[PDB]
Short mmCIF file of N, CA, C and O in Angstrom, two decimals:
data_model
loop_
_atom_site.label_atom_id
_atom_site.label_comp_id
_atom_site.label_asym_id
_atom_site.label_seq_id
_atom_site.Cartn_x
_atom_site.Cartn_y
_atom_site.Cartn_z
N UNK V 102 78.77 20.03 -8.15
CA UNK V 102 79.90 20.92 -7.88
C UNK V 102 79.60 21.88 -6.73
O UNK V 102 80.44 22.08 -5.85
N UNK V 103 78.41 22.47 -6.72
CA UNK V 103 78.08 23.52 -5.77
C UNK V 103 77.39 23.02 -4.50
O UNK V 103 76.94 23.84 -3.70
N UNK V 104 77.29 21.71 -4.31
CA UNK V 104 76.60 21.17 -3.15
C UNK V 104 77.30 21.62 -1.87
O UNK V 104 78.53 21.58 -1.80
N UNK V 105 76.56 22.05 -0.85
CA UNK V 105 77.19 22.36 0.44
C UNK V 105 77.68 21.09 1.11
O UNK V 105 76.90 20.22 1.48
N UNK V 106 79.00 20.99 1.26
CA UNK V 106 79.62 19.77 1.77
C UNK V 106 80.48 20.13 2.98
O UNK V 106 81.43 20.90 2.86
N UNK V 107 80.14 19.55 4.13
CA UNK V 107 80.87 19.79 5.36
C UNK V 107 81.90 18.70 5.60
O UNK V 107 81.80 17.58 5.08
N UNK V 108 82.90 19.04 6.40
CA UNK V 108 83.89 18.09 6.88
C UNK V 108 83.81 18.03 8.40
O UNK V 108 83.01 18.71 9.04
N UNK V 109 84.66 17.18 8.99
CA UNK V 109 84.73 17.10 10.44
C UNK V 109 85.19 18.42 11.04
O UNK V 109 84.66 18.87 12.06
N UNK V 110 86.17 19.06 10.41
CA UNK V 110 86.70 20.34 10.88
C UNK V 110 85.73 21.46 10.53
O UNK V 110 86.07 22.35 9.75
N UNK V 111 84.53 21.41 11.09
CA UNK V 111 83.52 22.41 10.79
C UNK V 111 84.00 23.81 11.04
O UNK V 111 84.49 24.13 12.13
N UNK V 112 83.90 24.67 10.03
CA UNK V 112 84.38 26.03 10.14
C UNK V 112 83.63 26.98 9.24
O UNK V 112 82.47 26.73 8.89
N UNK V 113 84.27 28.08 8.86
CA UNK V 113 83.64 29.08 8.00
C UNK V 113 83.62 28.55 6.57
O UNK V 113 84.49 28.83 5.74
N UNK V 114 82.59 27.75 6.28
CA UNK V 114 82.40 27.17 4.96
C UNK V 114 80.93 27.25 4.60
O UNK V 114 80.05 27.21 5.47
N UNK V 115 80.66 27.37 3.30
CA UNK V 115 79.30 27.42 2.77
C UNK V 115 78.49 28.57 3.36
O UNK V 115 77.50 28.34 4.06
N UNK V 116 78.90 29.80 3.09
CA UNK V 116 78.14 30.97 3.51
C UNK V 116 77.17 31.36 2.41
O UNK V 116 77.51 31.33 1.23
N UNK V 117 75.95 31.72 2.81
CA UNK V 117 74.90 32.10 1.88
C UNK V 117 74.27 33.40 2.35
O UNK V 117 74.15 33.63 3.56
N UNK V 118 73.90 34.25 1.41
CA UNK V 118 73.21 35.49 1.71
C UNK V 118 71.98 35.65 0.84
O UNK V 118 71.90 35.09 -0.26
N UNK V 119 71.03 36.45 1.32
CA UNK V 119 69.74 36.61 0.67
C UNK V 119 69.55 38.07 0.27
O UNK V 119 70.13 38.98 0.86
N UNK V 120 68.71 38.28 -0.75
CA UNK V 120 68.44 39.60 -1.28
C UNK V 120 66.94 39.87 -1.25
O UNK V 120 66.13 38.94 -1.27
N UNK V 121 66.59 41.15 -1.20
CA UNK V 121 65.20 41.60 -1.10
C UNK V 121 64.99 42.73 -2.10
O UNK V 121 65.62 43.78 -2.00
N UNK V 122 64.10 42.50 -3.07
CA UNK V 122 63.82 43.48 -4.11
C UNK V 122 62.52 44.22 -3.80
O UNK V 122 61.91 44.03 -2.75
N UNK V 123 62.08 45.08 -4.72
CA UNK V 123 60.88 45.88 -4.51
C UNK V 123 60.19 46.12 -5.84
O UNK V 123 60.84 46.16 -6.89
N UNK V 124 58.87 46.28 -5.78
CA UNK V 124 58.05 46.51 -6.96
C UNK V 124 57.17 47.73 -6.70
O UNK V 124 56.55 47.84 -5.64
N UNK V 125 57.12 48.64 -7.67
CA UNK V 125 56.42 49.90 -7.51
C UNK V 125 55.14 49.93 -8.35
O UNK V 125 54.78 48.96 -9.02
N UNK V 126 54.47 51.07 -8.32
CA UNK V 126 53.28 51.32 -9.11
C UNK V 126 52.73 52.70 -8.83
O UNK V 126 52.59 53.10 -7.67
N UNK V 127 52.39 53.44 -9.88
CA UNK V 127 52.09 54.86 -9.76
C UNK V 127 50.58 55.11 -9.82
O UNK V 127 49.77 54.18 -9.83
N UNK V 128 50.22 56.38 -9.86
CA UNK V 128 48.84 56.84 -9.98
C UNK V 128 48.80 57.95 -11.01
O UNK V 128 49.62 58.88 -10.97
N UNK V 129 47.84 57.87 -11.94
CA UNK V 129 47.72 58.85 -13.02
C UNK V 129 46.31 59.41 -13.06
O UNK V 129 45.35 58.76 -12.62
N UNK V 130 46.19 60.61 -13.61
CA UNK V 130 44.92 61.33 -13.67
C UNK V 130 44.46 61.48 -15.12
O UNK V 130 45.26 61.81 -16.00
N UNK V 131 43.18 61.24 -15.35
CA UNK V 131 42.56 61.34 -16.67
C UNK V 131 41.43 62.36 -16.62
O UNK V 131 41.25 63.05 -15.61
N UNK V 132 40.68 62.47 -17.70
CA UNK V 132 39.48 63.28 -17.72
C UNK V 132 39.19 63.92 -19.07
O UNK V 132 40.07 64.11 -19.90
N UNK V 133 37.92 64.26 -19.28
CA UNK V 133 37.48 64.96 -20.48
C UNK V 133 36.15 65.64 -20.19
O UNK V 133 35.52 65.40 -19.16
N UNK V 134 35.71 66.48 -21.13
CA UNK V 134 34.46 67.22 -20.97
C UNK V 134 33.90 67.55 -22.35
O UNK V 134 34.43 67.13 -23.38
N UNK V 135 32.81 68.32 -22.34
CA UNK V 135 32.18 68.84 -23.55
C UNK V 135 31.37 70.06 -23.17
O UNK V 135 30.90 70.16 -22.03
N UNK V 136 31.21 70.99 -24.11
CA UNK V 136 30.50 72.23 -23.84
C UNK V 136 29.24 72.34 -24.69
O UNK V 136 29.19 71.83 -25.81
N UNK V 137 28.22 73.00 -24.14
CA UNK V 137 26.99 73.28 -24.85
C UNK V 137 26.50 74.67 -24.48
O UNK V 137 26.91 75.24 -23.47
N UNK V 138 25.63 75.21 -25.32
CA UNK V 138 25.04 76.53 -25.09
C UNK V 138 23.56 76.39 -24.79
O UNK V 138 22.90 75.43 -25.21
N UNK V 139 23.03 77.35 -24.03
CA UNK V 139 21.60 77.36 -23.73
C UNK V 139 20.77 77.43 -25.01
O UNK V 139 19.66 76.89 -25.07
N UNK V 140 21.31 78.07 -26.04
CA UNK V 140 20.67 78.07 -27.35
C UNK V 140 20.79 76.74 -28.06
O UNK V 140 20.28 76.60 -29.18
N UNK V 141 21.44 75.75 -27.45
CA UNK V 141 21.50 74.41 -28.00
C UNK V 141 20.69 73.39 -27.21
O UNK V 141 20.54 72.26 -27.68
N UNK V 142 20.18 73.75 -26.04
CA UNK V 142 19.31 72.89 -25.26
C UNK V 142 17.94 73.51 -25.03
O UNK V 142 17.06 72.84 -24.47
N UNK V 143 17.72 74.76 -25.45
CA UNK V 143 16.42 75.39 -25.27
C UNK V 143 15.55 75.16 -26.49
O UNK V 143 14.48 74.56 -26.38
N UNK V 144 15.99 75.64 -27.66
CA UNK V 144 15.30 75.33 -28.91
C UNK V 144 16.15 74.33 -29.70
O UNK V 144 16.95 74.68 -30.57
N UNK V 145 15.95 73.06 -29.38
CA UNK V 145 16.60 71.95 -30.06
C UNK V 145 15.56 70.86 -30.27
O UNK V 145 14.58 70.79 -29.52
N UNK V 146 15.77 70.03 -31.29
CA UNK V 146 14.75 69.06 -31.68
C UNK V 146 14.38 68.14 -30.52
O UNK V 146 13.19 67.89 -30.26
N UNK V 147 15.37 67.63 -29.81
CA UNK V 147 15.13 66.67 -28.74
C UNK V 147 14.98 67.37 -27.40
O UNK V 147 15.61 68.39 -27.13
N UNK V 148 14.13 66.79 -26.55
CA UNK V 148 13.84 67.32 -25.23
C UNK V 148 14.86 66.85 -24.19
O UNK V 148 15.17 67.59 -23.26
N UNK V 149 15.43 65.65 -24.37
CA UNK V 149 16.30 65.07 -23.36
C UNK V 149 17.72 64.90 -23.88
O UNK V 149 18.35 63.86 -23.68
N UNK V 150 18.25 65.92 -24.56
CA UNK V 150 19.62 65.85 -25.07
C UNK V 150 20.61 65.66 -23.93
O UNK V 150 21.56 64.88 -24.04
N UNK V 151 20.40 66.37 -22.82
CA UNK V 151 21.33 66.36 -21.70
C UNK V 151 21.50 64.98 -21.08
O UNK V 151 22.63 64.54 -20.84
N UNK W 1 94.18 17.52 15.95
CA UNK W 1 92.81 17.87 16.28
C UNK W 1 91.99 16.60 16.52
O UNK W 1 90.83 16.66 16.92
N UNK W 2 92.62 15.45 16.28
CA UNK W 2 92.03 14.14 16.56
C UNK W 2 90.73 13.94 15.78
O UNK W 2 89.64 13.83 16.33
N UNK W 3 90.89 13.90 14.46
CA UNK W 3 89.76 13.77 13.55
C UNK W 3 89.35 12.30 13.42
O UNK W 3 89.81 11.43 14.18
N UNK W 4 88.48 12.01 12.46
CA UNK W 4 88.06 10.65 12.15
C UNK W 4 88.11 10.46 10.63
O UNK W 4 87.11 10.12 10.00
N UNK W 5 89.26 10.76 10.03
CA UNK W 5 89.43 10.59 8.59
C UNK W 5 88.95 9.20 8.17
O UNK W 5 89.23 8.20 8.84
N UNK W 6 88.20 9.16 7.06
CA UNK W 6 87.46 7.98 6.61
C UNK W 6 88.32 6.72 6.62
O UNK W 6 89.23 6.58 5.79
N UNK W 7 88.06 5.79 7.54
CA UNK W 7 88.89 4.58 7.59
C UNK W 7 88.60 3.60 6.47
O UNK W 7 89.49 2.85 6.07
N UNK W 8 87.37 3.59 5.95
CA UNK W 8 87.04 2.70 4.84
C UNK W 8 87.85 3.06 3.61
O UNK W 8 88.41 2.19 2.94
N UNK W 9 87.94 4.35 3.30
CA UNK W 9 88.66 4.81 2.11
C UNK W 9 90.17 4.68 2.24
O UNK W 9 90.87 4.88 1.24
N UNK W 10 90.68 4.36 3.42
CA UNK W 10 92.11 4.19 3.59
C UNK W 10 92.72 5.10 4.64
O UNK W 10 93.65 4.69 5.34
N UNK W 11 92.21 6.32 4.75
CA UNK W 11 92.74 7.27 5.73
C UNK W 11 92.46 6.78 7.14
O UNK W 11 91.31 6.73 7.57
N UNK W 12 93.52 6.41 7.85
CA UNK W 12 93.39 5.90 9.20
C UNK W 12 92.86 6.99 10.13
O UNK W 12 93.22 8.16 9.99
N UNK W 13 91.99 6.60 11.06
CA UNK W 13 91.49 7.54 12.05
C UNK W 13 92.64 8.09 12.88
O UNK W 13 93.60 7.37 13.20
N UNK W 14 92.55 9.37 13.22
CA UNK W 14 93.67 10.10 13.80
C UNK W 14 94.16 9.48 15.11
O UNK W 14 95.35 9.54 15.43
N UNK W 15 93.25 8.89 15.89
CA UNK W 15 93.66 8.28 17.15
C UNK W 15 94.51 7.04 16.89
O UNK W 15 95.50 6.79 17.59
N UNK W 16 94.15 6.26 15.88
CA UNK W 16 94.88 5.03 15.58
C UNK W 16 96.27 5.34 15.05
O UNK W 16 96.52 6.39 14.45
N UNK W 17 97.19 4.40 15.28
CA UNK W 17 98.54 4.53 14.77
C UNK W 17 99.16 3.19 14.43
O UNK W 17 98.54 2.15 14.65
N UNK W 18 100.40 3.22 13.92
CA UNK W 18 101.12 2.04 13.48
C UNK W 18 100.24 1.06 12.71
O UNK W 18 99.88 1.32 11.56
N UNK W 19 99.88 -0.05 13.34
CA UNK W 19 99.08 -1.07 12.68
C UNK W 19 97.76 -1.38 13.35
O UNK W 19 97.39 -2.55 13.46
N UNK W 20 97.03 -0.36 13.81
CA UNK W 20 95.81 -0.63 14.57
C UNK W 20 94.54 -0.49 13.73
O UNK W 20 93.78 -1.45 13.60
N UNK W 21 94.31 0.70 13.17
CA UNK W 21 93.15 0.99 12.32
C UNK W 21 91.83 0.80 13.06
O UNK W 21 91.80 0.31 14.19
N UNK W 22 90.73 1.21 12.44
CA UNK W 22 89.40 0.98 12.96
C UNK W 22 88.93 -0.42 12.63
O UNK W 22 89.36 -1.02 11.64
N UNK W 23 88.01 -0.93 13.44
CA UNK W 23 87.66 -2.33 13.27
C UNK W 23 86.19 -2.52 12.91
O UNK W 23 85.88 -3.29 12.00
N UNK W 24 85.27 -1.81 13.57
CA UNK W 24 83.87 -1.78 13.14
C UNK W 24 83.64 -0.55 12.28
O UNK W 24 83.48 0.56 12.81
N UNK W 25 83.60 -0.74 10.97
CA UNK W 25 83.49 0.37 10.02
C UNK W 25 82.25 0.26 9.15
O UNK W 25 82.14 0.97 8.14
N UNK W 26 81.30 -0.61 9.50
CA UNK W 26 80.07 -0.77 8.73
C UNK W 26 79.06 -1.61 9.51
O UNK W 26 79.41 -2.64 10.08
N UNK W 27 77.80 -1.17 9.51
CA UNK W 27 76.73 -1.87 10.21
C UNK W 27 76.06 -2.84 9.24
O UNK W 27 75.47 -2.42 8.24
N UNK W 28 76.16 -4.13 9.55
CA UNK W 28 75.57 -5.17 8.70
C UNK W 28 74.09 -5.32 9.03
O UNK W 28 73.72 -5.66 10.15
N UNK W 29 73.25 -5.05 8.04
CA UNK W 29 71.83 -5.37 8.15
C UNK W 29 71.63 -6.88 8.07
O UNK W 29 71.84 -7.48 7.01
N UNK W 30 71.23 -7.48 9.18
CA UNK W 30 71.09 -8.94 9.25
C UNK W 30 69.77 -9.41 8.64
O UNK W 30 68.99 -10.12 9.27
N UNK W 31 69.51 -9.00 7.40
CA UNK W 31 68.30 -9.39 6.68
C UNK W 31 68.63 -9.45 5.20
O UNK W 31 68.76 -8.41 4.55
N UNK W 32 68.77 -10.66 4.67
CA UNK W 32 69.22 -10.84 3.30
C UNK W 32 68.14 -10.40 2.31
O UNK W 32 66.95 -10.33 2.63
N UNK W 33 68.59 -10.09 1.09
CA UNK W 33 67.68 -9.76 0.00
C UNK W 33 67.44 -11.02 -0.82
O UNK W 33 68.16 -11.30 -1.79
N UNK W 34 66.42 -11.79 -0.45
CA UNK W 34 66.15 -13.06 -1.11
C UNK W 34 65.05 -12.90 -2.15
O UNK W 34 64.20 -12.01 -2.08
N UNK W 35 65.07 -13.79 -3.14
CA UNK W 35 64.10 -13.82 -4.22
C UNK W 35 63.03 -14.88 -3.91
O UNK W 35 63.17 -15.66 -2.97
N UNK W 36 61.98 -14.91 -4.73
CA UNK W 36 60.88 -15.84 -4.52
C UNK W 36 60.79 -16.78 -5.71
O UNK W 36 61.48 -16.62 -6.72
N UNK W 37 59.92 -17.78 -5.59
CA UNK W 37 59.75 -18.76 -6.66
C UNK W 37 59.05 -18.12 -7.85
O UNK W 37 58.03 -17.43 -7.69
N UNK W 38 59.59 -18.35 -9.04
CA UNK W 38 58.92 -17.91 -10.25
C UNK W 38 57.67 -18.76 -10.48
O UNK W 38 57.71 -19.99 -10.36
N UNK W 39 56.57 -18.10 -10.82
CA UNK W 39 55.27 -18.75 -10.82
C UNK W 39 55.18 -19.82 -11.90
O UNK W 39 55.88 -19.78 -12.91
N UNK W 40 54.30 -20.79 -11.66
CA UNK W 40 54.03 -21.88 -12.59
C UNK W 40 52.62 -21.76 -13.14
O UNK W 40 51.68 -21.47 -12.39
N UNK W 41 52.47 -21.98 -14.44
CA UNK W 41 51.17 -21.88 -15.09
C UNK W 41 50.77 -23.15 -15.83
O UNK W 41 49.68 -23.18 -16.42
N UNK W 42 51.60 -24.18 -15.82
CA UNK W 42 51.34 -25.42 -16.54
C UNK W 42 51.39 -26.66 -15.65
O UNK W 42 50.70 -27.64 -15.93
N UNK W 43 52.22 -26.64 -14.62
CA UNK W 43 52.26 -27.75 -13.68
C UNK W 43 50.92 -28.00 -12.99
O UNK W 43 50.55 -29.17 -12.83
N UNK W 44 50.17 -26.98 -12.56
CA UNK W 44 48.84 -27.27 -11.97
C UNK W 44 47.90 -28.03 -12.89
O UNK W 44 47.13 -28.88 -12.41
N UNK W 45 47.94 -27.77 -14.20
CA UNK W 45 47.04 -28.41 -15.15
C UNK W 45 47.56 -29.81 -15.48
O UNK W 45 47.85 -30.14 -16.63
N UNK W 46 47.66 -30.65 -14.46
CA UNK W 46 48.23 -31.98 -14.66
C UNK W 46 47.74 -32.96 -13.60
O UNK W 46 48.16 -32.90 -12.44
N UNK W 47 46.87 -33.88 -14.00
CA UNK W 47 46.46 -34.95 -13.11
C UNK W 47 47.57 -36.00 -13.02
O UNK W 47 48.35 -36.20 -13.95
N UNK W 48 47.62 -36.68 -11.87
CA UNK W 48 48.67 -37.66 -11.60
C UNK W 48 48.06 -39.05 -11.55
O UNK W 48 47.20 -39.32 -10.70
N UNK W 49 48.50 -39.92 -12.45
CA UNK W 49 48.10 -41.32 -12.44
C UNK W 49 49.27 -42.18 -11.97
O UNK W 49 50.35 -42.13 -12.56
N UNK W 50 49.05 -42.96 -10.92
CA UNK W 50 50.13 -43.68 -10.26
C UNK W 50 50.66 -44.81 -11.13
O UNK W 50 49.96 -45.34 -12.00
N UNK W 51 51.91 -45.18 -10.88
CA UNK W 51 52.58 -46.24 -11.62
C UNK W 51 53.07 -47.31 -10.65
O UNK W 51 53.86 -47.00 -9.75
#
């Protein structure tokens, strides 16, 4: 049914148009930490806690 | 506009009129589609003794 079919009287028939889309992507920030006291690394059982 | 409406299907070409029509409307390939001999598997296994 939809086949492009021409005749001898070639004219404004079978017009086609094209489309252009787009794809996005963002950037997000993360992070975490932890706190310690000098009284937790000075007199503590382990020497290499840090 | 002097078209070439399909003469094979019946529509006479626009130039032609009354009783003229197109005359060469198909190219004949001058090479027939022929078949070959069906093979034999029992005739060879036969000696011939003359009579």
